[PDB]
Task: structure prediction
Amino acid sequence: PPPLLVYKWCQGINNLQDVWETSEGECNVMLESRFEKMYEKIDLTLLNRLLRLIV
Amino acid sequence: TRLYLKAEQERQHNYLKDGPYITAEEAVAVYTTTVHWLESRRFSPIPFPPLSYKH
Amino acid sequence: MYNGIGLPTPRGSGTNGYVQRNLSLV
Amino acid sequence: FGTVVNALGKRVKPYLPQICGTVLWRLNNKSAKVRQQAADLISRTAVVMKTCQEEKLMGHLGVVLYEYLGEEYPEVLGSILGALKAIVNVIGMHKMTPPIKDLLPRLTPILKNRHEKVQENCIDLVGRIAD
Amino acid sequence: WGKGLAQSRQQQQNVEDAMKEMQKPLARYIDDEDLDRMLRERPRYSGPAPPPNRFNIWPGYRWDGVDRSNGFEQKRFARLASKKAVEELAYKWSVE
Amino acid sequence: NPRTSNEVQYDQRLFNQSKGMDSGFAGGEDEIYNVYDQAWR
Amino acid sequence: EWLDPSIKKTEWSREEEEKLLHLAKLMPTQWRTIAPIIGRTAAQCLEHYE
Amino acid sequence: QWENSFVSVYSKDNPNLLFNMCGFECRILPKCRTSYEEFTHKDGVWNLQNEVTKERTAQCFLRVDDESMQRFHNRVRQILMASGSTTFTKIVNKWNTALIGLMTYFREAVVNTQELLDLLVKCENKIQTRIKIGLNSKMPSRFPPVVFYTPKELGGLGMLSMGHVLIPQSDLRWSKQTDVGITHFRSGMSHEEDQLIPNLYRYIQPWESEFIDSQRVWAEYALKRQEAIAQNRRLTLEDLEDSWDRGIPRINTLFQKDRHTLAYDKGWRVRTDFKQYQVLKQNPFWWTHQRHDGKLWNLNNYRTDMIQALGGVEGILEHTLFKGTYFPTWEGLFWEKNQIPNRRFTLWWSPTINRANVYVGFQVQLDL
Amino acid sequence: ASEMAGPPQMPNDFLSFQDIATEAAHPIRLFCRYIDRIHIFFRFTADEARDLIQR
Amino acid sequence: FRRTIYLAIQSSLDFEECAHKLLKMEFPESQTKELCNMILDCCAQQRTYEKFFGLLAGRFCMLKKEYMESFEGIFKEQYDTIHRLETNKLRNVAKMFAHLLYTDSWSVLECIKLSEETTTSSSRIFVKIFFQELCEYMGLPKLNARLKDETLQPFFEDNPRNTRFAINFFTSIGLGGLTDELREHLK
Amino acid sequence: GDYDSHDIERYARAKFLDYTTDNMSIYPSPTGVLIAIDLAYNLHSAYGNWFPGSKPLIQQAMAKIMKANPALYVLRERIRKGLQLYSSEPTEP
Result:
């Protein structure tokens, strides 16, 4: 379930190797975004060739 | 609703007039990349459901 | 003394605005 | 039950209040199961509840049953109308405790009721009174 | 022997129960029988497992060790369980 | 000949209790109620 | 789809076949886009393509 | 687009790491940075435990994101607006559904968001105020909470209520900056007497705990399979009676009768996400499905505790006509299993709705 | 990407890698995509960061 | 009193609010045993472990010196029901004392003993959990400290047999990294 | 009655003192009794003068009527119907 995903995400961060160590000047970056228009910009002609690779 | 469908009809008509925006070489890059991925992933294609399928 | 606490006015609030102090603080 | 009572004749008279007490209390219970059944019980016990000349009981069944005519469950309502029918065949027109002026127009709207038993008993009763 | 030697002993246990009454008129909690009571929580057949029996009886000593049945226990066992599901999903209906 | 199987797997009394599939509970309609699993009394 | 008198019911000329084949190779499987370009019904140009 | 995106950065200058996943606004403060005094708190604080060293290396704070609160608020507004006709019992169903929709999902994060608590309070007051409007009165003495909070088994509306709780308030000037704590409380809603009302949040198990419980329950379950294997005896119900309702998959869901069919269902969770486009109505429960995930809450207690807080059967019924019906007992009360039902709801509470003591009124004698 | 999904013979779970060296091998650390939304978590040594900043 | 406690606790979000609600009421103090007995029972009896009901018991201690005492007592009161309670609620407890003891509301332990002599298989599980929780916080090193200065005996000894039961039993729990010194002692 | 005042007795003694001490109400003798019955709560009480034998007779008579009088049964039944309450168990306890 989505909240459990949030938990996997947090402990996933905290389990990374030396994640919080700033000693040498390490820098962490969290980035969140959207694809903006994604559905609307899918091209049918391309989508056909892309599906031909699958099914 | 009416506005949105108007600007919609606009965008369809402009996509036909102005042609595909993905250009060409880009599209080839996409298709090729996907091909490499599915290659290294041993993905077998999904076939058509047979007449006799127990599920 | 409204010490920056409570609503400006309990008008839309759904409450009676009553602010008593935290009886268990420390 | 009906055969037992009609066979006992008026030897059954001391037992009525217990009967009909059970008949009303059951006449509530939980709806769809037992309403129709207690109703039919009244229907078949009509004549016995008549000839022994217990009039209070006819008041009871008359207006009490009169009240259920707003019941939304058809399979119940049908049995109710049937009971009313049987009560009409024992006590006469002008002696009806729910005077026909009350009853009949209260019956009139029910004819839309679709599901069967209602239409059956209803049209029957409208027939008895109309005749 | 006729009736049920197994049945008779169970009846016997009740007789012991009467004995409990004479000393234990109205027992509650910590009184000693309850104590040890909650302080633990003739060949008999060995092999495998014996399918569940409504009445939960282990098979005898030398029992063949094979299920020979019409399966009415399970299905009777399963069906009864199914009804319990039915009473609940019957209810779920009621609120609407 | 015993009738044997690998492992044990599970009993029966439970192995068929709750309905099946059924799916959640309507698109999520207001009219449904259904908050409580058992009756009051 | 069918009863509309503006719909063209007849054999396909050579030009319409050239145009239909070319376009169908241009935009695979899109019949409602092609059908107005050739001036025929989508179901009809489908049947003619097969 | 940079506009819709968001970025956070953790560096020797920035201790805190912020982000937003799904509906959750998450902050992460390590203990390797300046955590100063180490402390516990309400379950709104998650402890991030190193898998290797079994140590609590940081803390994640949860907060209910803005857009979520906005959606809930538009959902309440949907209940008020879209219903001018609909029955009063029906609206309370709408409220309850939306409210558990919020609470089962967010749980812990709700308690650390003051804005939510406010919004819930004012919104409860808006739907109850609307039901008031429904009859014609706004008079509080005419609508004591016993009418709204009685489980409709006894003829109330069965309203689930989270909004009688006290709302913590301290030092706006400092609370906009340093997270000072709680020096005051504001009264959320009225109580006729001192009294009480139970809150939903207390009867729902927090997400953290149900997670740990899930892991433990599954591991132990695999153990129950192994011991059963070595014993060759299959497992009964009782050895599973402990964990029966527990775990995120809700272990009992293995034993669903139709389980086969569901084993061949995949991607259900995303189809639920795209049902909003196929179907007009708005699903609050979109995130889960009881058939794959089981039922993740049991509110059965909330009803009992509700009746207790109102003074017991005799307490709630004391607001009704019940003593009028001359029924010997209420143990056998059984209900009728743009018309009357509304009109009936008034009689049942008519001793409470109409009162000899009111704020303002002109006492009128009915005709005859 | 292949590093994340790992070898198809022994695929990985949601967040984990075949080895630590696979974690330190690259700036991109955690990549979570929920429908059209992108959640990314980066680990940088000072040099890699400086290079990015300079570009 | 017992009913008012429940209603005040079921009403309040957070753990902070219930104490405020409870203290505010100014119910009679001596009962400050049974009340707390109430909280320990009320949630532990409650179906699954929840963080809230455990915190409440503790704060209620820091506010008045007695409340702490009231708790330690109630932990003693467990001995009688160490066997008796059914095998779920041990899952709530073990941790639930785990969270008073990680956060310092340790040596009160010592009263607890490891023997095949007298330990309830109940009690066995009870303590088992208690460590598999408290560990998961302190992380088995700070726990190394707390023990090493603890002088817990009935747990940690004579009785080379009971040193097999001890050490073995902490191989069973699985931690068994604080059983070293005792291993040496066996030798 | 209603929720606020369902108390029958204070009502009875009140109306008695008032009607007896008022000049508008007409009674042939100052000696009498007033019986109040609250329909809403099905309660009955009385306040007023007494004479030997009257108290037990009136107690018994009221206790009977409250179980008996057909009119009250018509009221009670109409309430049941308007409320659509129906009992679960036959024969009653």
